[PDB]
Amino acid sequence: MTQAEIKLCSLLLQEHFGEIVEKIGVHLIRTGSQPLRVIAHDTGTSLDQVKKALCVLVQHNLVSYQVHKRGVVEYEAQCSRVLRMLRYPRYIYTTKTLYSDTGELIVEELLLNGKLTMSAVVKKVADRLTETMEDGKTMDYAEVSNTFVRLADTHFVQRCPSVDGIYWQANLDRFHQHFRDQAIVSAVANRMDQTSSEIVRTMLRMSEITTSSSAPFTQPLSSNEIFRSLPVGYNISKQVLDQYLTLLADDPLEFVGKSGDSGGGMYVINLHKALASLATATLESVVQERFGSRCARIFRLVLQKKHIEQKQVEDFAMIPAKEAKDMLYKMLSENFVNILSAARMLLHRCYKSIANLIERRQFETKENKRLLEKSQRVEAIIASMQATGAEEAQLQEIEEMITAPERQQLETLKRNVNKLDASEIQVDETIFLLESYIECTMK
Secondary structure, three states: OOHHHHHHHHHHHHHHOOHHHHHHHHHHHHOOOEEHHHHHHHOOOOHHHHHHHHHHHHHOOOOEEEEEOOOEEEEEOOHHHHHHHHOHHHHHHHHHHHOHHHHHHHHHHHHHOOOEOHHHHHHHHHHHOOOOOOOOOOOOHHHHHHHHHHHHHOOOEEEOOOOOOOOEEEOHHHHHHHHHHHHHHHHHHHHOOHHHHHHHHHHHHOOOOOOOOOOOOOOOEEHHHHHHOOOOOOOOOHHHHHHHHHHHHOOOOOOEEEOOOOOOOEEEEOHHHHHHHHHHHHHHHHHHHHOHHHHHHHHHHOOOOOOOOOHHHHHHHOOOHHHHHHHHHHHHHOOOOOHHHHHHHHHHHHHHHHHHHHHHHHHHHHHOHHHHHHHHHHHOOOOOOOOOOOOHHHHHHHHHHOOHHHHHHHHHHHHHHHHHHHHHHHHHHHHHHHHHHHHHOOO
16 A cells, blocks of 8 residues: 555544544545445544544545445545645745745635635735734735636636636646656756756756656757746856757766757657656665665666676675675665665555654654643733833742743754754655656656
8 A cells, every 4th residue: 555655544544634634535535436325334433423434524625525336325435546645835935935925825725725715815915914914905816816827827727627706726736746846957057067957957947838747758849949948047048058058968877868959959848757857866865874885876877777697796896805795785685786676665654663763753743732731821911011011020930930941841842853854845745756656757
C-alpha cells in the first residue's frame, strides 16, 4: 500500500478532523469500495457516526462514492489524495507569494472547507481581510475576485464537475506543474547559471498548457518564437540565444535536447532525464548523510558504470582493497545502480520518517498537556492588566507562577516542535520529487 502510507493517512485525518474520520477513512483504504452499512458493521460503529465521518471526508474532496451493482451507494478512499494534505501549506504559501495575501486566503479556505462556490469564498475572504485592514477602507470584493479569476485562468483553480454557486476546488496538478517547473529552473540555475534558467522558465511558461505534469518530454519550440516570448527584464540577442541553446542541448547533464533545425532550430525539454538527475542528486546527499562524503564521493563514481563487479570499483576508488569491499557491500546493502528501484525504496523510507515526526509532535503536546493551559491562563491575566491595572508586581506574580523548569520545558518542547515542523517540510519537497519521477516513469 504501503503500511507507512496507511499509518500516515491515519495520522493526517486524526490531526485535522478527529477519531471518527480516521477510523472510517482507515477502513475505506483497508477494504476498498464499501456501502454505508458494511462500513457501520465491520467497524463496530453505528450508521450516524459513519455518516458524520463521511461528511468531512467528501466535503473536503477526498472520499469517493459510486452506486455499485445492486443500486447500493458504495464508498471509497483514495490514498494519494490523502497524502496531498502534506504539501497543503507549501501550496498555500507559494500562492501567497504569487498573487499576494489576497490569494493566500482564497486557497487557504478552499482546502480546509474543501468544496466552496465562487461567491462564498469571495465574501468570506473580503471580510477576513477587512478585519485585517486598518479600521475602514474595507476590502473591495473586486480585487479578491480578480485574483480568483486569475487563478481559474492559470488553472490553479478549477470547477467541481458532475456525476449563486456552484462548487470550485484546488488544482494541485498545475501546482505539480509549477513545482516540477521551479525544481527544474533552479536545477539549471545551480548546475549552469541564472540566464540559462530564465530561458527554461520561458520554455515551461509556454509548456504549462500544451504539456502534462507527467509527460517525459515537452513540445518542440523554435529559437525565434522563444526569442519572441522573452521576458522584459532581458534584452538578450539572437546569437546570444543561439550559442546558449546549442550549449543547453549539447550538455552532458542534458535536461534539454534538439529536435529539428529547421529554423532557428527546433528544441525540446527532457522532463524524464531532468527528473532522474534530480532524484540522483538527492541520493548523493543521502549517501553523504548516512555514509558520508567518503561513501558519497565513491557513490558519485558509481554514476559512470556499475553496481557489479568490484574489479573496476577498488581500481577507480583510490584506496586499499578491504575498504572498497566494505563500502561496496554497504551501498548495495540497502539497495543503492538501479535508478527507479532505489527511488521507490527511498519513497517508503520517507513515509517512515514522517510517521516518526508526527508521533513526536503528537506525543510532545500529549504528555505536556498539563502546561498548555497553565500558559493560557498566564496570558489571560495580562488581558485585563496592561490596560486596566498595569500592575508590575502582578506581572512578577505571573512570573512566579511559571517557575524556571516549566518554562524551560516550554522552550524545549517548542524548539522540538520546530525541529519536527522543519524536517516535515524538507521531506515534503523530497516526496513531491520522488512521486513525480515515479509518475514520470509511467509512460
